Amino acid sequence: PGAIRTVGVIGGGTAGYLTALALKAKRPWLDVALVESADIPIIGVGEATVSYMVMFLHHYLGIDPAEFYQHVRPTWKLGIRFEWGSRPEGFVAPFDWGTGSVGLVGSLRETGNVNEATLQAMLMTEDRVPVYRGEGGHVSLMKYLPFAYHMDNARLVRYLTELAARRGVRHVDATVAEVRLDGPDHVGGLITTDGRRLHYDFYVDCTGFRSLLLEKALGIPFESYASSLFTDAAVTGTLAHGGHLKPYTTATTMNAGWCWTIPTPESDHLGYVFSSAAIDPDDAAAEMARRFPGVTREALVRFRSGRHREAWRGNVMAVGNSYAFVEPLESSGLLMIATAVQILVSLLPSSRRDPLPSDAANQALAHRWDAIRWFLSIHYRFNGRLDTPFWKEARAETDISGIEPLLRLFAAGAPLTGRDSFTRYLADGAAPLFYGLEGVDTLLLGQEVPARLLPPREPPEQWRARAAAARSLASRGLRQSEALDAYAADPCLNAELLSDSDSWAGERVAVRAG
Amino acid sequence: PADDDPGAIRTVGVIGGGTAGYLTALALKAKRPWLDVALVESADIPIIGVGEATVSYMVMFLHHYLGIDPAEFYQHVRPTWKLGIRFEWGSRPEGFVAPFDWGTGSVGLVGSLRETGNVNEATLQAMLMTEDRVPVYRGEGGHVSLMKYLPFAYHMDNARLVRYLTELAARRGVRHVDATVAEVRLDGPDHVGGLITTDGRRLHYDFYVDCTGFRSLLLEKALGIPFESYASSLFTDAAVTGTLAHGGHLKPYTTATTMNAGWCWTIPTPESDHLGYVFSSAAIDPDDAAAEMARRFPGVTREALVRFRSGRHREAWRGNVMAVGNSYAFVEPLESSGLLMIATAVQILVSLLPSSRRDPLPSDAANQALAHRWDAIRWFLSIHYRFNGRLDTPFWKEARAETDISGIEPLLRLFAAGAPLTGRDSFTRYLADGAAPLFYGLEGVDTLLLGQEVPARLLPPREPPEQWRARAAAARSLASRGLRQSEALDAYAADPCLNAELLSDSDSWAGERVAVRAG
Ligand SMILES: Cc1cc2nc3c(=O)[nH]c(=O)nc-3n(C[C@H](O)[C@H](O)[C@H](O)COP(=O)(O)OP(=O)(O)OC[C@H]3O[C@@H](n4cnc5c(N)ncnc54)[C@H](O)[C@@H]3O)c2cc1C
Ligand SMILES: [Cl-]
């Protein structure tokens, strides 16, 4: 009948492949085709992620962790090191927060900074990881301390494409020349440059920034985040690291933006995200080369920060850059693809006659992205590190209006995570899901935004003893490169991460969200 | 709160003496006992006189947050118990029941629908309600109460409640001022400088709470905060109240009965049933409403006509004024959210009140939180009206055709594709959640929609039918052996440790440990 039986995923990036894999994993009766152009290249960049993504890949898509490691060769991300704000040494922003908490107010009072708030924060400052050569073999605390991956993009996409073929996704080589509608909010088919006509019951727009189905064919307008987020290009390249693998992404303040450093086994991958209005791309490249002597110059990529009004209209939903994008300052790109895919796979109707839940999907995604926007806005507003024209404009004119009510709450009594339960609960709704009140507090305290600090409620010497047990675990951790070789040598180390009842990424916790 | 600071907030004037004003004054003095807290009220403008049913949270608020001793409360207020709402509503001749005990009391909604054709075996409290019994049992040489395991609320005679709260406030050092405010005098942008009484006294406080009821003297009238009507969804605007004898038989629930131009509550007190026919005055004259009520509930007295409007103000807090209760917002008492929302506004104020006029003012956070909570309640109430197929009167035809449900329509589309929403996968449940009211939840939306036979694809069960049946039979067993309410209330009056275990036991839904967590 009108059963939705076929789905065409249009575009093959990480967005396309994540989408096709989920549809096959959860609705294996669907016929799922992934359509991509061998001549229009995929965007090429989003390489760091967040801890949730580890569970998405392994539990939700059922990707074997031994085979993932061998094919993609990921490195570990314990958080982000911010060379950011007016503290000469900057600050670290770790993923752990419950099981790893040592104490934020104690860090600030003992140390004047947030860099001892947690066990991962201390691991970051040591460039070490919570894996230990314990006579016997290895002993890993990774299963207790949430972490994420850095993944070389080319390798990740190759592996996902191999996976799709296994799981019975059909591949179509083709360039879409036109999207033909056959009714108001309804794609009737796709005409390729070579004259084929492709028809599916449902279309997923993963065509990147061009947004061929969502924006161009269905006319869904774009909503700019430009009053908050002023950058619009990036110069990328690579820099040798001598085999020393920093267990974090770095975000470094630059004259007209900021530069990421993302470690892979072969080398560090860099990107100077900048405002075109504030500097010429060549000049940005020259500044990058000067700041990072030895870095190559590989590519200029342009983007715009914002989302479309709608992700899902009619028989089309957009996943990835065809819907929305923000700069990778908090590595939210893959997170939001995964959120969108989970929405589609959950909500996709059984038949064409059914009640279409596009409004709910639209609202859900608008809410999520708009909260990320306001979280990013406070990275810009409060960055006192440099006094260039870009940074003066960012401190004076960044729009923070959507998070201003939470900032006032922080001003009155920080950290928000140290407030009474009711206030914490109330503040929670302004904070991005996933990044949480803890990420807002880290950024605000890290940048020394004026606030009334809360009383420690607990005596100094106590925090101090927690601090020492943590520091001692931290400096005894292995160096990352050794630890990764241990994981490759013992596949049963990843398998414990996923099975264990007490793992942060265990089967138990997985079920409790997907 | 520093001793030096000539900028400190030291005095608070709570303007108004209904339940909103007394609860606010008691909360301020309990949690910030250094404040000088004054309650101002006019002997010449009576309180509204009518809000008697509550939700399970209110039990914790009263006893934990305000430190009200339960034996004393029982002695002075003489509450009855509310296990839920009985809805004589929708097209099922028997109606349906909506209990508070989803979770610990769950038997299963899908199994109840498949095996019984309705929702009334979805939980243990649903079975207690249809038995008119309560989960208290004569044990060997005592009483065994399962009240600590199953969330419940109070019904409270309004005149006794107010008198008790008034007594408590005096005993705890709240100052009383008898005055009729004539003018709220501003002394700057967003700043009340003082109040002038009708006789010419000038009252001044560092902070004001507007508890003036619908008139909203400080918030709306002085500060100009505008009103946002919920009238596209909620069309009733009047109630006729009265009492009806019950023989001493105390129903363990509030009843909501569909009427020709609205609906009628039945709230048990120990002395009689308290009733109110909530109606659209556009649809029926008040005397004709009173006549209908006497047809439907023969013997009922006619006590009072009360008028109201459904909606909220744009903001609750501006500068040195916060509004609590009907001064801020109101919806008809179909889900008894009034006291809940008062309690929520109080916690907001008590937590967020600055120590001094220099401190940052978190009034936008308070306003957004309150707007979101009230708006969600609005849309939940909207679906009680849109889908009530019980009667074919012009009021009910209009309701079914024109009730604005826009704000919950995306959630209704989800429901239709696979009900109950509480049976969906975890990700879908979390997404759906965001449209449901925080206290009432997806379970409340599911119960109202399935109770009213709103078409949907019913989800398959997740367990063999015999397992549901076994669990139902265990529950039916317990429900049929419960005491009648009136005997059980006598047990609680006789033995204060029943309430003590409810409030202290780590296993209790209303225990210390849950209280600490809820703030
Ligand atoms: C019909 C109906 C049924 C309801 N049912 C329920 C229910 O079952 N459960 C529930 O939880 N809620 C219910 N509510 C809401 C609940 O009733 C609250 O008690 C009440 O409606 C609001 O209390 P209040 O203190 O805000 O206002 P009021 O009780 O109106 O008090 C206002 C106070 O302000 C004072 N005041 C006003 N103007 C001045 C002035 N100029 N100077 C000095 N003082 C002044 C008055 O003297 C009075 O003391 C219901 C409401 C209505 C209308
Ligand atoms: Cl109410």
From TrEMBL, chain B:
Keyword line:
FAD, Flavoprotein, Nucleotide-binding
Chain residues that bind FAD? 20, 42, 45, 48, 52-53, 181, 326, 339
Keyword Flavoprotein in annotation: yes
Q: What is this protein called?
A: Tryptophane-5-halogenase
